[PDB]
C-alpha cells in the first residue's frame, strides 16, 4: 500500500501493452458502488477510448466507463449501455463520479460536480467480486486482449471505489478534496502493478 | 403527513402507469392560487410532457402546466391556453412559480425567479375544489387515461400550493428556500399515494 | 395625490380603449425637461408601440417616445424624429431617462443608465403647457383617436417629469432609486384618471 | 486658462465650420511627445473621421490620429501612416494615449489602457513647434480647408500633451484619473477658441 | 551581468540582421531543462516565426519553440517535432514555460499557467552544451543564416533557463512573478550581446 496523494499514472504513447493492474481486497458481490477518478486527455475530439475497465470471468464489460466519439460518456453494466450526451467538449482535466444501485437500477452520473439526470439500468443484477481492474485499456477478455484504438493516452489518478451509494453532499466533498474513507479501493493506501510504458508524476489538476 | 424536505419523486422509465396521487384538504373553490415546485428533466429538447395535472369532474385540464416542444411552458386554466415562449433551453434543474387570480384574470409566471410579463386568461372563472392532483402524467379523464408521450421522466419535489396571490418579495423568499407556510398543499406535511415505478431520493438541486 | 411607490399600471389586453390620463399642474411653457419611467413589455420584437404620449392642441406628437420595430427608440419633439438604434433587444424591464433643452437643441437619451450619444433636434422651439398626457396609447388627436397596433401591452410606473436638464450624476441617482424631488409630475404625489382595462399592482422591477 | 475638469466639447451637427482652435505655449521642436484624450462617437461603423489634427506650415498632417472605416485607428507622423487594426468596434466612450520618440522611431499606442504592439515610424524626424492644433476637423491646409466627411460628430475632452515619453505606469495613472502635470497642453489650465456650433457640457465618461 | 527586471528586448522591424546573442555559463550536457519567457507579437495570425533558437554544432534545431501558422506552438528537440494545437489565438502578451526530461521523454508545455497534455519526444537523447542561443531569429546554421519570414517582430523578456524539471507549484510561482533562482540563464544577472535594430525598454506585461 503506497500513498499516491498528488500523483497520477501517465500513458504517453498510444499502445496496446502499457497498462496498470489494480487489485481490490474484495470478498463480497457488489449490490451497489460508486467510483471516482480524475483523468485528462485530448482524444475526446479524435477517437473513442476506455476510462475504467472492470472485468470478470463472465463478462469483459462488467463495468465500463467509455467515451464514444461525438456521443459522450457511455456507462455500461452487465453488458447494457446508456448514453449521457455531451454536446461540446472542453480541453481540460475532468472529474467524474458514477454510482449504481442494484435495488432500483438507478444510475447517478456526476461530471464536474454537476449531476446528470438519473436513469435506469439492469435492475436486479448482481456484480461479481472476482474482478480484474485495468486502467488505460479496454479489456475484452480476462486479463488481456487490448485494442490500440481503445487505449487511453493521458494522465489519471485519485481512483477510489466504495460499495454503497454516497449522498450528493458526499459527492460535493469528494469534489472538494475533503477527507474521505473509501472501503474497496484506496488511492491513499492503494495496491497496484505496472506494465509497459507507464510512469508516476505529480498531478496537474489542483 | 410526512416531511419530504430534501426529497423528491423519481420517474426513471417512460411509462403510462408510474404516477403519484396527491390529496388536497380542500373544501372551498379557488378564486386564486399559486403553485411552486422543482423539476428536472432532459426531455425539453425531445418531446412534450406534463409538469402538473390538476383535474376535476368537469375538465381534464382544469389546471395544466405543460411543456410543448419548440414552444415553451404552456399554462392552461379552464380549457384555455396561453404560451410563454422560451427561445433556448438549458440542461439544469428549473424552479417555477405560477399564480392566477379570478378577479382580474392576471397570470404571473415566474421561472428561475425572473418574472415573465403578466397576461390575461379566463377572467371571472371559478376553479372547483373536487380535485384529482396527479404528477408525472397528464390526465385526460378523471383519475386515469394517461399518455406515454406525455408522461414525464425525471426528478421533482417541493410542490406547494396556496389559495391567494403572493407578492414578488414572497416569490423571492420561496426561491430563497426561506421559511414559508403553504395552506393548501404542504411539502412539509404532505399527504401522498404512489403507483408503479416511483421512488424517493434526496434532491439534486440545492 | 396618491403614493404609487412600488406600484405600476397594467395593460394586459391589446386594445384601443384602455388608457390612463395624467394631469400636470403645469402653468409655464417648457424650455427644457426630462422624463423618467420604467416599462416592461415583450412586443419589442413584434410590432411598434407608444411609450409616452404628450399632446397639445397644436400637435398630436408634441413629445413622443416610440419604439419602431427593427429600429429602436424613436424620440420626437415638435413633429421631428431622430432615431437611437438598438441592434439587439433583451427581454427584461428597461429604464429610460430622456432630456431636451430649447437653448441648444441637445437631446440626452439614457437607457439602463448608459448614456447614448448626444444629438440635435428642433433648436429654438417652445413646448406648450396646454397638455394631455396619455399612457398606453399613442394619441393622434387631442384626447382620443388611439390605434390598437400602437397601444402598449405591459407594465409601467415611476413616471416622473422635471422642467430643467438634470446632470449625469442626477440620472445615476434616479437609476439608483435615491431620493429626488420632481417638480412637474410626481410619482410620489401623482394625480391620475384610469379608463378601461387598467389595474394597479406591485412593480416587478427592483 | 480655464479649468475644463469634468467638461467636454460637443459637436452635434456634421458640418465643415464648427471647430475649436487650441493654442500651445510651445517654443521648442518636439523630439518626442504623448497625447491623451477622451472621445465618444458612433460614426465608427459609418465613415471616417479625424480625432486630433496637429498641423504646421510644412505639412497638413504633421500629426493625425484618424479612424478609417473597417480598418481602425490610423496614426501618421510627417506624412507616413501605420495602421492599428481593430477587428470589431464597441459603442462606448474610448480613451486613447499615443506616444512617439524621435530617437528610436518607436510608437506606443494605448487604447482603453491595454497596450498595442510597438511599431516603427519616421526614425530621425523632427516635429516643428509652429503649430495649429484643431479638434473636430481634419485640416488639409494651414488653418482651414475642412471636410464634412472627415468632421467628427460627438463628445471629447481631457486633451493633454507632454513632450517626453511617459512610462507604462504613468499611462495607467492617466487612465486612472490620478493627479498628473502636463507641460505642453493642460486640460486643467487650458487655452482655447471656439467657432461655429460647439458647446461646453459635463462629461459623460466617468 | 545586468539586471533586466522590468525590461525587454524590442524587435520593431521585420529584418534578417537584428538579433541578440546570449551566452550561457554552461559546462555539462543537459539531461533535462525548463525554459520560461514572455513574448508579445501580432504575427500569430499572419506568418510563422521563431520564439527561441538553441543551436549547436551538430544541429541547427537542437531546441526550437516555433509558431506555425494555423497550427500553434511547435516544439522540437534533436530534430523531431510535436505539435500543440491552438484553435484560436488572442491578441495579448503570452507566457510560456516548457520542460523536457531525458529519462522519460516527457515534455511539459505550459501556456498562460494552464498545463497542456504531456507527450513523448526523443527518449534517451542528450542535448549538448556547446550552444549558441539566439533570440528574434531562427538559426539554421551555427551563428548565422537567418530568415526574414522567420524573424520575430515584437517584445520579449524574462528569459530564464534551468537544468532540471520544476514541479507544477514551481511553474505557478514563476507565473506569479515570485522569487526564484535560475541556474543556467538568469534574467536577473543576464549576459548578452545585441546586433542591429534592437532596443531596451520597460516591459508591457505586468
PDB file of C-alpha atoms in Angstrom, chain A residues 10 12-13 40-42 154-155 197 199 201-204, chain E residues 101 104 106 110 115-120 123 167-169:
ATOM      1  CA  UNK A  10       0.982   8.645 -17.225  1.00  0.00           C
ATOM      2  CA  UNK A  12       2.117   8.982 -23.099  1.00  0.00           C
ATOM      3  CA  UNK A  13       2.210   6.585 -26.056  1.00  0.00           C
ATOM      4  CA  UNK A  40      -7.169  14.255 -18.585  1.00  0.00           C
ATOM      5  CA  UNK A  41      -6.721  13.639 -22.310  1.00  0.00           C
ATOM      6  CA  UNK A  42      -7.252  15.376 -25.636  1.00  0.00           C
ATOM      7  CA  UNK A 154      -3.065  10.861 -20.860  1.00  0.00           C
ATOM      8  CA  UNK A 155      -2.946  11.402 -17.112  1.00  0.00           C
ATOM      9  CA  UNK A 197       5.260   2.472 -20.678  1.00  0.00           C
ATOM     10  CA  UNK A 199       5.175   6.383 -15.115  1.00  0.00           C
ATOM     11  CA  UNK A 201       4.311  12.000 -11.788  1.00  0.00           C
ATOM     12  CA  UNK A 202       2.719  14.808  -9.765  1.00  0.00           C
ATOM     13  CA  UNK A 203      -0.863  15.569 -10.739  1.00  0.00           C
ATOM     14  CA  UNK A 204      -1.687  18.558 -12.935  1.00  0.00           C
TER      15      UNK A 204
ATOM     16  CA  UNK E 101      13.438  15.222 -19.419  1.00  0.00           C
ATOM     17  CA  UNK E 104      11.242   9.512 -19.817  1.00  0.00           C
ATOM     18  CA  UNK E 106       8.148  13.529 -21.263  1.00  0.00           C
ATOM     19  CA  UNK E 110       2.645  25.412 -20.052  1.00  0.00           C
ATOM     20  CA  UNK E 115      -0.816  22.853 -18.493  1.00  0.00           C
ATOM     21  CA  UNK E 116      -1.111  21.088 -21.819  1.00  0.00           C
ATOM     22  CA  UNK E 117      -1.270  17.296 -22.004  1.00  0.00           C
ATOM     23  CA  UNK E 118       2.051  15.574 -21.514  1.00  0.00           C
ATOM     24  CA  UNK E 119       3.567  13.908 -24.575  1.00  0.00           C
ATOM     25  CA  UNK E 120       6.646  11.957 -25.691  1.00  0.00           C
ATOM     26  CA  UNK E 123      13.568   9.360 -25.376  1.00  0.00           C
ATOM     27  CA  UNK E 167       7.209  20.976 -10.236  1.00  0.00           C
ATOM     28  CA  UNK E 168       3.773  22.399 -11.112  1.00  0.00           C
ATOM     29  CA  UNK E 169       3.789  24.530  -7.988  1.00  0.00           C
TER      30      UNK E 169
END
